[PDB]
Amino acid sequence: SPVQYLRWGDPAPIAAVVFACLGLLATLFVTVVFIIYRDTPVVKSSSRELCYIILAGICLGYLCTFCLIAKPKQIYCYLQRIGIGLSPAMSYSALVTKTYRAARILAMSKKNIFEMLRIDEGLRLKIYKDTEGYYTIGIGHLLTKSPSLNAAKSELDKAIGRNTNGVITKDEAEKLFNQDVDAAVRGILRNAKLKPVYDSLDAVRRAALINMVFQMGETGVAGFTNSLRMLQQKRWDEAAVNLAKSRWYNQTPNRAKRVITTFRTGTWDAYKISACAQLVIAFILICIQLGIIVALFIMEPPDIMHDYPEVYLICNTTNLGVVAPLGYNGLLILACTFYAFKTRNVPANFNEAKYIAFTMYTTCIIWLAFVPIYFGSNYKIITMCFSVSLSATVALGCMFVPKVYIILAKPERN
Ligand SMILES: CCCCCCCC/C=C\CCCCCCCC(=O)O
Ligand SMILES: CCCCCCCC/C=C\CCCCCCCC(=O)O
Ligand SMILES: CN1CC(=O)N=C1NC(=O)Nc1cccc(Cl)c1
């Protein structure tokens, strides 16, 4: 009984139980909210099937402390190794399929802007010079400002990853072009005149604004004071009429007409330009962890330590019984963090990606700090209980609590 150890002067078992119960309660509250309000734009936008797999992992995470703090029975040593290994794998492998899809969607958004300027601005697959003698390649991607041609091929190989001999491909010029777009968006966000208009426009019309920035510069796009105000108010027809009167339209009419048409429809007509698959891949990534656990059951069978007479249940789990599923879970965390950081600025689903990236930042530090803390500890059971509950609470508090707040507290925003 955890209450017996509390009055005896040890409040660790009773504290880990309350932690797990409160976590089970909050996990129960969060899940019911997503079941009831399943048809609301906030829940319908993200992957609903993957969230139930994440919440089930968090649920099993808090349940781990009930087999760590349990009576000396044999199946609990089996459930310990099966929960401390699978419950993180369930949450992280479902989250890696969510973050992987968010990155492929983001990569496809840059494929349509690259084809936009390949037709409008041009593209060279070998090194040239711009109007001021700076070595350049691709769609105006500056390589260096040194007069040495060997210096350009050096930076080019360092940017591509192979010996190019001064020649690249369309996919390699796109890799350099994505860096120029990221630098252009930062310049627009650092501009007081273009920042509000950029935030109101959708993904397609943002590309048309960036198209104008690449042709005329940030200070040149800021000159369309009236048209930018029309685009912000979603007066597309008025903006296209006003833009067709500009000197920019009369000097390069073949290009300005396509950018203007994009502002009109919000589509790519002026230019030539799975759900069940996520559950299967997540299911495959969970069975791999389970296969590791079952394989270690056969190598190192679970057994109750000693032949004793206690609240603490000591099993014969070795380092390999811990490190092998711990390392696989770590790989799931690295992959999650890689795609979460890659999409940290994606604003879809009420900035859902911002909260996922922050969750993986804390998860890495928590899991990294766990290795020296645990394997150097003489209270491994309790340090394991709090670690699993803390890591489960991070994912539940950072990813789901903000989404539940918007549902109940901000019904009109949703
Ligand atoms: C870069 C971010 C990393 C985040 C995940 C880290 C997870 C750590 C997982 C496995 C590392 C295992 C190290 C075990 C060393 C042996 C311990 C021992 O047996 O004494
Ligand atoms: C910002 C804080 C990050 C903390 C980083 C900690 C890095 C530890 C990760 C892996 C080290 C594994 C080496 C073996 C651990 C044995 C520890 C021990 O025996 O006490
Ligand atoms: C073994 N260790 C060391 C550590 O620091 N964390 C764990 N295990 C874990 O966190 N499992 C889990 C369970 C439910 C949800 C989530 Cl997100 C994670």
CA of 358 to the centre of ligand 2 (A): 21
Q: Which amino acid is at 384?
A: M
Q: Are 261 and 270 in contact (CB under 8 A)?
A: yes
- Angle of CA points 44, 49, 54, to nearest 5°: 110
Say if ligand 2 is within 6 A of residue 375 CB.
yes
Contact between residue 193 and residue 201 where contact means Cβ atoms under 8 Å apart: no
Cα torsion at 138, 140, 146, 150 (round to 10°)?
10
Q: What are phi and psi of 180, to 5 degrees?
A: -70, -30
* 118/92 Cα distance (integer angstroms): 38
CA atoms in the 13 A half-sphere facing the CB of 309:
0
Residue 69 β-bridge partners: 312
* Residue located via tokens 């092998």: 324
Query: How many other CB atoms are found less than 10 A from the CB of residue 295?
Result: 11
Distance between CA atoms of residues 3 and 6, nearest Å: 5
Integer CA distances (angstroms), 369 to 92, 364, 372, 376, in order: 18, 8, 6, 11
Q: Which of 53, 117, 119, 123 is nearest to 88 (CA)?
A: 53
Q: Tokens at residue 281, please?
A: 């891949």
* Residue 66 contacts residue 19 (beta carbons within 8 Å): no
Residue of 391, 295, 379 whose CA lies nearest to 92: 391
Question: Residue 263: phi, psi to the nearest 5?
Answer: -60, -35
Long-range contacts formed by 351-357: CB under 8 A, 24+ apart: 352/45, 352/46, 352/403, 353/102, 355/398, 355/399, 355/402, 356/95, 356/98, 356/99, 356/399
| 62 Rama class: left (phi>0) / alpha (psi -120 to 50) / beta | alpha
Please tell me whether 350 is known to bind a ligand: no
CB within 8 Å of 368: residues ≥ 6 apart:
none
Rounded distance, CA 348 to CA 409, Å? 20
What is the C-alpha radius of gyration for the chain, rounded to an integer number of angstroms? Answer: 28
Ligand positioned closest to the Cα atom of 366: 3
Beta carbons within 10 angstroms of residue 173's beta carbon: 19
DSSP letter for 345, please. T
Q: Which residues contact 137 (CB under 8 A, 6 or more apart)?
A: 124, 125, 126, 127, 128, 143, 152, 156, 166, 168, 173, 176
Q: Which amino acid is at 80?
A: Q
Residues 6+ apart with CB under 8 A from 299: 320
Q: Can you tell me the distance from the alpha carbon of 72 to that of 75, in angstroms, rounded to the nearest whole number?
A: 9
- Nearest CA residue ID for atom 8, ligand 2: 368
**CA gap 237, 227 in Å, rounded:** 10
Are the C-beta atoms of residues 56 and 395 closer than 8 Å to each other? Answer: no
Phi first, then psi: what are they for 125, rounded to 5°? -90, 5
- Read off the tokens for 155: 């930076």
Reply yes or no on whether 352 is catalytic.
no
| Residue labelled with tokens 């042709």 | 215
Q: Decide: 168 and 136 in contact? Cβ < 8 Å.
A: no
d(CA 81, CA 302): 9
Residue found by looking up tokens 């993957």 in the block: 50
Q: How far apart are CA 48 and CA 25, in angstroms?
A: 20
Long-range CB pairs of 195-198, under 8 A, 24+ apart, other chains included: 196/232, 197/228, 197/229, 197/231, 197/232
Q: Is 150 known to sit in a ligand binding site?
A: no
> Which residue among 31, 80, 81, 87 has the greatest number of ligand 3 atoms within 8 angstroms of its CB, and so is best to mutate?
87
Extract long-range pairs of 228-233: CB within 8 Å, 24+ residues apart: 228/193, 228/194, 228/197, 229/197, 231/197, 231/200, 231/201, 231/205, 231/263, 232/196, 232/197, 232/200, 232/201
Q: Give the N- to C-terminal CA distance of the chain in Å, as an integer.
A: 46
Nearest CA to ligand 2 atom 15: 372
Q: Are 124 and 137 within 8 A, CB to CB?
A: yes
| Residue nearest atom 19 of ligand 1, based on CA coordinates | 319
145 vs 124: CA distance, rounded Å: 18
> What is the maximum span of the chain, computed from C-alpha positions, in angstroms?
92
Q: Is 202 a catalytic residue?
A: no
Number of Cβ atoms within 10 Å of the Cβ of 275: 10
Burial (CB < 10 A; 0-12, 13-18, 19+), residue 229, is: middle
**H helices within 111-190, ranges in order?**
113-120, 149-160, 170-189
- For the four alpha carbons of 189, 194, 198 and 204, in that order, the dihedral sign comes to negative
Which string of DSSP letters, residue by residue, matches 12-55? Answer: HHHHHHHHHHHHHHHHHHHHHHHHHTTTSHHHHHS-HHHHHHHH
Q: How far apart are CA 387 and CA 287, in angstroms?
A: 23
Question: Rounded to an integer, what distance in angstroms lies between the CA atom of residue 219 and that of residue 58?
Answer: 50
Which H/E stretch holds residue 356? helix 348-375
What angle in degrees, to the nearest 10, is found between the helix axes of 253-265 and 113-120?
160
- Separation between Cα atoms, residue 65 and residue 312, nearest integer Å: 11
* DSSP code of residue 400: T
Contact present, 252 and 216 (Cβ < 8 Å): no
> 82 in helix, strand or coil?
helix
β partners of residue 137: 141
Return the exposure string of 113-128: e unless at least 16 CB atoms fall within 10 Å of the residue's CB, then b: bbbbbbebeebeeebe
Nearest-CA residue for atom 16 of ligand 3 = 392
Paired tokens of 201: 């426009």
Q: Could you give the domains of the chain?
A: 1-111+273-414 (no CATH), 112-272 (1.10.530.40)
CB of residue 321 inside a 6 A radius of ligand 1: no
Q: Which ligand is nearest to the CA of 332?
A: 1
- Which tokens sit at 367? 């899991």
Discontinuities after residues in the chain (C–N over 2.5 A): 111, 273, 309
Resolution (A): 2.7
Is 391 within any annotated ligand binding site? Answer: no
User: How far is the C-alpha of 274 from the C-alpha of 73, rounded, in Å?
Assistant: 43
What is the CA(115)–ligand 3 centre distance, in A? 43
Contact 34, 401 (CB under 8 A): no
Say which residue the tokens 């965390």 belong to. 333
Instruction: Give phi and psi for 132, each to the nearest 5.
Output: -120, 20
CB distance 84 to 384 below 8 Å: yes
CA-wise closest residue to 210 among 189, 237, 230 = 189
